[PDB]
């Protein structure tokens, strides 16, 4: 419903603000295209702050990976803000903001669980693959677990199955660190 | 194909003037650009009004919330305009702007109802599902309520099938405020309004 | 597919002169592009006459409504003219321009009838679903005696089935005001 | 992938020669641009002509009406050129040029016939249907009786099954005036 | 995608030259729009030759007889230029050069054979489709004939099914008159 | 989507260095391209030397033998780069650039074979197709006679089934000049 | 759904900076756009390092050994990075980067496998297909032995099946030679490594 401008580019122009939008199903391609703007943005200045809005059911597991360690690597402070929801792999990324600059507005929500994926050919390839899934898997605790702070036990126990958060519960969790508060209505 | 020009994109001049669009289905990808249209207009003033244009049947409901907690956070005053219907989450939207500034022209149609979803796998699956949607339907309820300033009770009740409105049906529920005729006409100060 | 690139575009041009062309099937897009210039010209000014050609065979009938709603709330004359066909959301649209100034080529034709829809799910759903679009059927009937000002009965009976007119018929029926006549 | 760029494009420059081209099936978005087009040029000018060159095999029958009034409703004298060929309605808009001013390449060819259409549903409405295709073809009968100058009768003997005509017969029938080798 | 772009795009380059290019299946769409490179062409000069690469496999009848009549109305020169191959109506466009100035490269190929198509409908529909179809094989028939000098007797029997020629084979029928190895 | 802009498209860049990229399937639409850029190529210089890139699993016949054709007419000297493979088509082209001009990198793989196609329709219409394409068979024996200097005997033998070849064995062959790891 | 203009296109903004980006699946495409690129690189300076960042499950081996030769024709000293994942013909071009100049980032994979295809037709024509196959296996085979520093009996032996690899498993393989987890840090010379 194809792409203002003022005035380039609307998305454009947030990224003049230092704005990174992750927005709908991740993938390669939108990792590449995030990661791109990260990495453009480090280069503007490896100080500055730099702003992710996230919006995304989930998506790749690697691709989601990806933009993690790339959050992580540069030197800019990150904060995340969570808009809609952030589940899955989006979740991740909301929770891997630097502490303290980890938002959502108070309407959006939280989902966390276990990586799924899919295994076929003989039985040698289903054995190499059901343990790189758990490679995954354990990886992908171990991540939550140093964001949110919680143990691995409580990580395990809380990803096995979905699990959905409210913006406040996301808090007391530890995947973010501030719930936004709406003013008041102008009337 | 499609879209004019005038002097962008005749989208793009409405932006100039303050104007969102916010039309057809509602998916992540029109929040995000009503979203970033809202915060780029409130960065050029946090004080002049915005006025967003609705004209959908609804879309996803994460979807619709975060236009709405944005709409909702911004500090302008925000004017909703109902053209042609604003049903489900549209007519959230609707119902959530400045109060005394919902609006819609007189043949538009407002709709309200629960919301709907699809749950499978494991019956431990299916019971995490039907939780979260449960959550979701209480938590719009809730919202519903808020701006339309009615009891919990009145909108379980006329939220459990489908609730089509006319214009003066939903400034009476409390979604409107204003059923406009025409902007001020020659030598008027106001503008002319549909009278119950 | 549409465009030559003028002096913008053909479409453009006619826009600087205050055209809006709807056609083909209406639907929330074309109404948000024809509100948004109907919009547009009216900010450039209020007082002018606004032109709307219109070649199409229908749509949905909200976006209709949409169109219509706001060709009656701007202050702006507004002129409306059938260029081929106004059928079904577009002769509503032909029929709602100003008294006086709604036009028609001698060879166009205009049709009228019912909306048409469907309903389904559970007999409480289907019973609310029907009750909505008889709505919408009064509420169009209405409409069309409004701009016609032809009695709801005769609107009625006109339009419970598809209802071809020609330009004169049109006229006599009060869809539109002028035949234009073709020169030497 | 297709439009050449110019000294835009190749179409847009042949407009500035008051050429109007009028090519494959005849649809809503074809007339529109079609009409756009001769609306444009006449307020550039409604005493120069204009040169609308035809190459199609018809399309559908109230899209071509439209570009029809709009050709017959401005003032300039309209010059039709049938080129690869003119079938259907695009026969009705050759026919339809200035008279003295409908021309033709030596091999297009030339086709009319009555309308064709569909109909389902209830009998009342096929009635309502059939009615209204009728119409259209006497409608569609009388726009070529007048233009070609041929008798009601002779029309309806011609269109009751496609009939094709090469430049000399369509010219003899009255759809066209001259066929042109060289300029 | 494809269509590097220029001192415009490629093509558009090309133009500038005097050179156009009828590439692919030919159609109402190929047609117009190498029709309006040649109208063009003769505004900006109706002396300087014009020319005419092509590498086509065929197309719609009509549509190659627009691009045909287009050719043989301007004033300016053409030289043809088979690249690749030249079959069906693209042959016909590649013998329609200006004599003497038909030319293939050397590992071209040129084929021609009689339309095809289909009839349908009610047994007189058919019988009006057949003469009809019949007719634009003549038509081309006599078309080929004139370009070539080859009796009518010849034309048929070479057409009558698929016919491959090399670019001797097709000087030496008459389809061109120069197979050149370099400039 | 797919692609970057300097200083335009990377292509149109590559093309002012008078590089011209043949890539993927060769059919009539590739080899246009390729035979424009070729002929801008030679207009801005028939001296200068041109460079045709070629990653492609070969392709329409008719088509490789028009760019085949075009590269043989111009008169500028024309260095074949063998990228990934030159396979089919693609490696008739190779084989075509100007003599101790022909390249390719290490890894890249050449194959050559003779043509394959269809033919359906009357046992008539059948003998005619089949005629056809054994023609094209010993068209392009003799190109690649010709080019690779191997006997008409040799390259019989060599094309009747898929035939690979590594960058030297295609060397050895006749097929390029100098496989290239770095620059000379 | 497209690309932000910054200053244009973001990917054109970081050619600008000599960076060239392998994302997605390797095809005769991208393997085009890739040597496109840094062939452009290589005429704007023939001397100055190139950046290559990759993300990529695999794709067509004649297609990616076309990008691998290339990084191995130009002049140019060529740094590769990894992110999320350099799978199959990705971790190829991982390794074939300059030596001391081959990275990963902490989370990515990598992994390597032999070739797979089809083979169809008669059975002269499936053993021809049979043979190609199988030298091809053997040339990527001495590709990573060459740029891993490890026997061909250890890579037969780690590509027979798909074999997964942490950065650092990785990097002891001769892959990569090292995992970043900070560029350098402020008041730091060097990169901070794991
Ligand atoms: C933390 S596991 C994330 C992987 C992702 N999950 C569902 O959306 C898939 O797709
Ligand atoms: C209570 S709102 C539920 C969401 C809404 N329903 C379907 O159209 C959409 O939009
Ligand atoms: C009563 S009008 C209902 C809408 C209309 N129906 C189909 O032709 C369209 O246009
Ligand atoms: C009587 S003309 C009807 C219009 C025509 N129909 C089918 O060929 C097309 O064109
Ligand atoms: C006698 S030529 C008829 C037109 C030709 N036939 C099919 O390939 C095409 O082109
Ligand atoms: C003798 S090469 C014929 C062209 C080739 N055929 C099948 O692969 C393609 O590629
Ligand atoms: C030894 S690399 C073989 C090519 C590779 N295989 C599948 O993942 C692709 O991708």
Redesign the interface.
Known sequence: ??????V????????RERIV?V??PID??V???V???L??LQ?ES?KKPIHM?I??PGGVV??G??I???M????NPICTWC???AASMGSLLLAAGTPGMRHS?????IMIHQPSGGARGQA??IA??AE?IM??KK?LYN?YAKHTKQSLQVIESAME??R?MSPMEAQEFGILDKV?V??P???
């Open positions: 419903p194809l792409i203002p401008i003022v380039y580019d609307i998305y454009s122009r947030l990224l939008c927005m709908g390669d391609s990792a590449s295209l990661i791109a703007q990495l453009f280069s490896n809005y919006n995304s690697t691709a990976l990806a993690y360690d790339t992580q690597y540069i030197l808009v809609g929801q507005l108070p309407n959006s929500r040698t390839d190499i693959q790189e490679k995954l990886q991540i199955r979905d959905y936004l709406h003013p209505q102008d009337g």
